[PDB]
C-alpha cells in the first residue's frame, strides 16, 4: 500500500484567496476565513493534511460548527472537538467535504474576511478548493478543435486562430473558475444547465455552479454540476459559439491547456 | 501472438493519429486501476509473460514496415523487428533480458545492442539532444525507413539512435501524456516538423517521479513539489494532482491503493 504523507500546504479557493484562521488567533471556536494568500511562515494559512483525514493549523483542527447548511467553520482543539466535525475529504474535483454531514466547505462571499461555512454541495465556485503552495493561478492558452485557441472578446467566447493575444490567455483559479487574463473579475460562465446554452464571460460575483470547470483526463472541460462539457457548436468555429453539451468525445469537445 | 496496433504515416491525419494513440493505451493497461482519475499501467509483479508486451506496427509512404515492442509496465520501447531481423536495447537486468526472449520468436536473426534505450545514451549516440531532433509525420517516416534499412548496411548508428528518439517520443511518450500527444497532433495537423519544447522535455524526464508523487499523494496533495517547465524556459512547481489530470494519461505502477 502506498505511503500516506502529511504535507503542509495552503488551501486556495474562491477568487484565489487563502483559507485563513482569523487574526492568527487559535482560541477554540475562532472562525476560519478567506484572506489574501500570505508569503511567509505564518501558521494561520499553512495546513497539515493529516493521515486521519484531519486538516491542521498550528496543531489545531479545521472544524465545522455543526452538520446543518450555513453553519460556520472554526479552529478547534483536535482532541476536544467532536471527532466527526474534524474529518474532511479532499476530492480530486476541488471539493472539501465533511463526511458525517455530507456538507461541503464554502465561502458564500468573495470578499477578504468572509467567514467560511459548510453548505450543500452544488459544485459551485464558492466550494472549489486547491491544496497548494502556489498562490498565483496558472495562466495558460487553451487549445481545442482544429488547434484553434479559446478567445475572450468582452462577454463573448469563441475559438480562433492561435497567436501568442492576451485575449487568448486564461487564468485557471484554484476555485475552479476559468478567467480571462485581461479581467480577472470575470469568469467563463454558463448561465444555466440546459444543453446548447451558449457559454459567455460574466462577473465572478455569484461564484455559481455554472462558473466551475475541471479539465478531465479524457481532454474534455467539464462543468461539474450539470455534467455537460464545453463544445464548439456544430464543430464549426465560424459560428463563434461555445456551448454546454452532453459528452460524446468528438474533437469539438477536446481541449488542451498549453502552458 | 502479442496484441498489435498499426499506424501509417501515409495520409496520416489528426484523427488517425488519435485513434492510434488511443488504441495503444487501450492495450497498455485495462483502465481498471485509476488513481485520482489517472490510469495506472499493470503492476510488473503478477503480470504473466504472455501479457508483458504489445506490438506497434509502423509503415510509411514507401511501404516500409517496422514493428516496435513496448513493455506494458512502462509503455517504453524495448526493441523492434524489421523483416527477419530483430534488435533490442541492452536490458537493465537479467529478468528483462529473459522477458525479451519471448518477443519475435519466429525471427531468424536476433541482436542485443550494447547500449540501453535511455535518452541520455541515445542522444550521445545520435550526436544531438531531443531539443534539436525534430518531430512530426516526416521525421516518423524517415525514422521508419532508417530502422528498416539497419539490417541492410545502409543506416549508420547516429541515424538509428535518432530514429529511436523519434519513435519513442511520438509513440511511448504520447501514450504517457495527452499533452505530448497534443503536441504531436499539432505537428501532424499543419504538416510541420518541430523539435519538442522544454515543457515536453521536462514532462518526459519527470514521468517516473510524477507517477510516484501522484500515487503516494495525500488526497492529491504531493509530499514534495515537482518542478515542470512552461513552453518557454520558465519553471514552475506542482503541488497537487489537479493540474496533471489533463496532462498525464498513464502512470507506471508504484504501489497499491
Amino acid at each position, epitope marked *: 500500500v502506498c505511503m500516506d504523507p502529511e504535507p503542509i500546504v495552503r488551501i486556495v479557493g474562491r477568487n484565489g484567496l487563502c483559507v485563513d484562521v482569523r487574526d492568527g488567533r487559535f482560541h477554540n471556536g475562532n472562525a476560519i476565513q478567506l484572506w489574501p494568500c500570505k508569503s511567509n511562515t505564518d501558521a494561520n494559512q499553512l495546513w497539515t493534511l493529516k493521515r486521519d483525514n484531519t486538516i491542521r493549523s498550528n496543531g489545531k483542527c479545521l472544524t465545522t460548527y455543526g452538520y446543518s447548511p450555513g453553519v460556520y467553520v472554526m479552529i478547534y482543539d483536535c482532541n476536544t472537538a467532536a471527532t466527526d466535525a474534524t474529518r474532511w475529504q479532499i476530492w480530486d474535483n476541488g471539493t472539501i467535504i465533511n463526511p458525517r454531514s455530507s456538507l461541503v466547505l464554502a465561502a458564500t462571499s468573495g470578499n477578504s474576511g468572509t467567514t467560511l461555512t459548510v453548505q450543500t454541495n452544488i459544485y459551485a465556485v464558492s466550494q472549489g478548493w486547491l491544496p497548494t503552495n502556489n498562490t498565483q493561478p496558472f495562466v495558460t492558452t487553451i487549445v481545442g478543435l482544429y488547434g*484553434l485557441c479559446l478567445q475572450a472578446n468582452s462577454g463573448q467566447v469563441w475559438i480562433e486562430d492561435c497567436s501568442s493575444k492576451a485575449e487568448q490567455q486564461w487564468a485557471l483559479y484554484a476555485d475552479g473558475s476559468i478567467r480571462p487574463q485581461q479581467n480577472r473579475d470575470n469568469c467563463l460562465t454558463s448561465d444555466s444547465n440546459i444543453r446548447e446554452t451558449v457559454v459567455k464571460i460574466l462577473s465572478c460575483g455569484p461564484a455559481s455552479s455554472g462558473q466551475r470547470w475541471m479539465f478531465k483526463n479524457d481532454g474534455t472541460i467539464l462543468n461539474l454540476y450539470s455534467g455537460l462539457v464545453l463544445d464548439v457548436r*456544430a*464543430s*464549426d468555429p465560424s459560428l463563434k459559439q461555445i456551448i454546454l453539451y452532453p459528452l460524446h468525445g468528438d474533437p469539438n469537445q477536446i481541449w488542451l491547456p498549453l502552458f | 501472438q502479442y496484441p498489435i496496433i498499426n499506424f501509417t504515416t501515409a495520409g496520416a491525419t489528426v484523427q488517425s493519429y488519435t485513434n492510434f494513440i488511443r488504441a495503444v493505451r487501450g492495450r497498455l493497461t485495462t483502465g481498471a486501476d485509476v488513481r485520482h482519475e489517472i490510469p495506472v499501467l499493470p503492476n510488473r509483479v503478477g503480470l504473466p509473460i504472455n501479457q508483458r508486451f504489445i506490438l506497434v506496427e509502423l509503415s510509411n509512404h514507401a511501404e516500409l514496415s517496422v514493428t516496435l515492442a513496448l513493455d506494458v509496465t512502462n509503455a517504453y520501447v524495448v526493441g523492434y523487428r524489421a523483416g527477419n531481423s530483430a534488435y533490442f536495447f541492452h536490458p537493465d537486468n537479467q529478468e528483462d533480458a529473459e522477458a525479451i526472449t519471448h518477443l519475435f520468436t519466429d525471427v531468424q536473426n536476433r541482436y542485443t545492442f550494447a547500449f540501453g534505450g535511455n535518452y541520455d545514451r541515445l542522444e550521445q549516440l545520435a550526436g544531438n539532444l531531443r531539443e534539436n531532433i525534430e518531430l512530426g509525420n516526416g521525421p516518423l517516416e524517415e525514422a521508419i525507413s532508417a530502422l528498416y534499412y539497419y539490417s541492410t548496411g545502409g543506416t549508420q548508428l547516429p541515424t538509428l539512435a535518432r530514429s529511436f528518439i523519434i519513435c519513442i517520443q511520438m509513440i511511448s511518450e504520447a501514450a504517457r501524456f495527452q499533452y505530448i500527444e497534443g503536441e504531436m497532433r499539432t505537428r501532424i495537423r499543419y504538416n510541420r516538423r518541430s523539435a519538442p519544447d522544454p515543457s515536453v522535455i521536462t514532462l518526459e524526464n519527470s514521468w517516473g517521479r510524477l507517477s510516484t508523487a501522484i500515487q503516494e499523494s495525500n488526497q492529491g496533495a504531493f509530499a514534495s513539489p515537482i518542478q515542470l517547465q512552461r513552453r518557454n524556459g520558465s519553471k514552475f512547481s506542482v503541488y497537487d494532482v489537479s493540474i496533471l489530470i489533463p496532462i498525464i494519461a498513464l502512470m507506471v505502477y508504484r504501489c497499491a491503493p
Partner: nanobody
Amino acid sequence: QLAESGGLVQAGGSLRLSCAASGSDYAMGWFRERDFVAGITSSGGGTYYADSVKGRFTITRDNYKNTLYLQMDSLKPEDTAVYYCKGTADGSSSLGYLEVWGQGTLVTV
C-alpha cells in the same frame, strides 16, 4: 469537394437533400446572409440544430458512403432559400482550419 442535389413543393410537404462528397474527417453542416441550419460532428454523435428549424429538420451522415443528408419535414414558406452544404477540417488556412462549401440547391415552398 461537395455537390448538392434533391432541391418545389407546397407548405407542409417533405424534401430530402443529399450532399455527395468526393473524398469522414470533416464535420458537416447545412446552411441556407448564409445562416446555420444544422450540423453534425465527424463521427456523428453530436447533432446541433438552429432554433428556427429545431424539431422539424433532421441532419444525418454516413461515412462509408461519404454522403450527408438533410431531412426537411413540415416545411413553411420561411424555409424557401438556397441550401448549401458545408464542411470543416483540420488543415492550414487564414481561418486556421479548412472550410469547403457546395454549389447550392434551390428550394421553394
